[PDB]
Write a protein that binds this ligand. Structure first.
Ligand SMILES: *[C@@H]1O[C@H](CO)[C@@H](O[C@@H]2O[C@H](CO)[C@@H](O)[C@H](O)[C@H]2NC(C)=O)[C@H](O)[C@H]1NC(C)=O
Length: 296
């Protein structure tokens, strides 16, 4: 697209303030992820498109406070995954790069959205511009849809299959807040409790794995953003959320920009907070809510 995409990006900025344009021009380095025109339409963001306050938040997360081209992205993700900050100080992004040359496939994950770069390295004065096929910050998948499409959630998604725990996550009549342990988290659990870990991924113990996951799943009429949990555990003592057959009592705090979860005697870092979905929100955590009282 490019031609159509960029003008559309600016048109959207015009409809919602213009304040966005100020922040962009006040940056020494800036990289914009401009959704294709097809992305701005098929997104059917008709709902939020009218909310000028939200549109600004959506627009802001498409603006990277840095000079980032394909090469730089590849490099930054060499050792670990680089979480890239945006104008939206409540949303960061990160990329995944596959193949090389004309076979290169670049995708980005942000605000609950996974988009593919359909055009990259468009030069700019202080940076670059890339065209993506989806509008970040506007989920087009349910919690379940996300779980099957996010490689980082592969273990938790697979574990929820043995007991058909996942089935329910497609329901649009409820709102789920799923605290999803990332793959690295389950791998760590494998080192801590190799036998119990082998069991969680066995049909024979579907009951156990379901019980473990239901502990991570909050079901209510509303979804809780990490910022909500903080406010709750701040005004009140801790936070109490309804799970499937019981409840979840945790406490959330801010720590050097990241959010932290205090469950029982454990402290787990929230790796990807607020991964919004159409029927809820997902919070990727560093380690699963597990004590060795569920292992022996
Ligand atoms: C966005 O979603 C896609 C689709 O699931 C992810 O693509 C996979 O990426 C892994 C890691 O390179 C590959 O092993 C798979 O083969 C890819 N699937 C396909 C068919 O494309 C992609 O990684 C996600 N992007 C992010 C940043 O999470």
């Amino acid at each position: 697209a490019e031609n159509g995409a960029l003008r559309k990006f600016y048109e959207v900025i015009m409809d919602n303030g213009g304040a966005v344009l100020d922040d962009i021009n006040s940056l020494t380095e800036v990289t914009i992820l401009a959704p294709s025109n097809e992305a701005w339409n098929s997104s059917n963001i008709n709902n939020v498109l009218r909310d000028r306050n939200k549109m600004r938040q959506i627009l802001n997360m498409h603006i990277i406070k840095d000079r980032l081209n394909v090469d730089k992205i590849r490099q930054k993700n060499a050792n670990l995954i680089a979480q890239v900050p945006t104008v939206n100080n409540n949303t960061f992004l990160y990329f995944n790069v596959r193949g090389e040359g004309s076979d290169t496939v670049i995708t980005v994950e942000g605000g609950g959205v996974n988009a593919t770069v359909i055009q990259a390295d468009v030069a700019q004065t202080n940076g670059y511009v890339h065209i993506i096929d989806h509008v970040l910050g506007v989920p087009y998948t349910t919690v379940l849809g996300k779980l099957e499409s996010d490689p980082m959630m592969s273990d938790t998604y697979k574990m929820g299959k043995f007991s058909h725990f996942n089935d329910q996550l497609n329901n649009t009549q409820r709102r789920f807040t799923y605290f999803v342990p990332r793959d690295k988290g389950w791998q760590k659990t494998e080192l801590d409790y190799p036998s119990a870990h082998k069991k969680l991924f066995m049909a024979d113990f579907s009951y156990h794995s379901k019980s473990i996951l239901e502990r991570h799943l909050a079901i209510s009429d509303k979804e809780y953003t990490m910022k909500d949990l903080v406010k709750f555990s701040q005004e009140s003592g801790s936070v109490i959320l309804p799970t499937f057959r019981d409840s979840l009592s945790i406490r959330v705090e801010e720590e050097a920009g990241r959010y932290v979860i205090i469950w029982n005697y454990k402290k787990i870092n929230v790796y990807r907070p607020d991964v919004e979905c159409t029927n809820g929100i997902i919070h990727v955590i560093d380690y699963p809510l597990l004590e060795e009282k569920d292992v022996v």
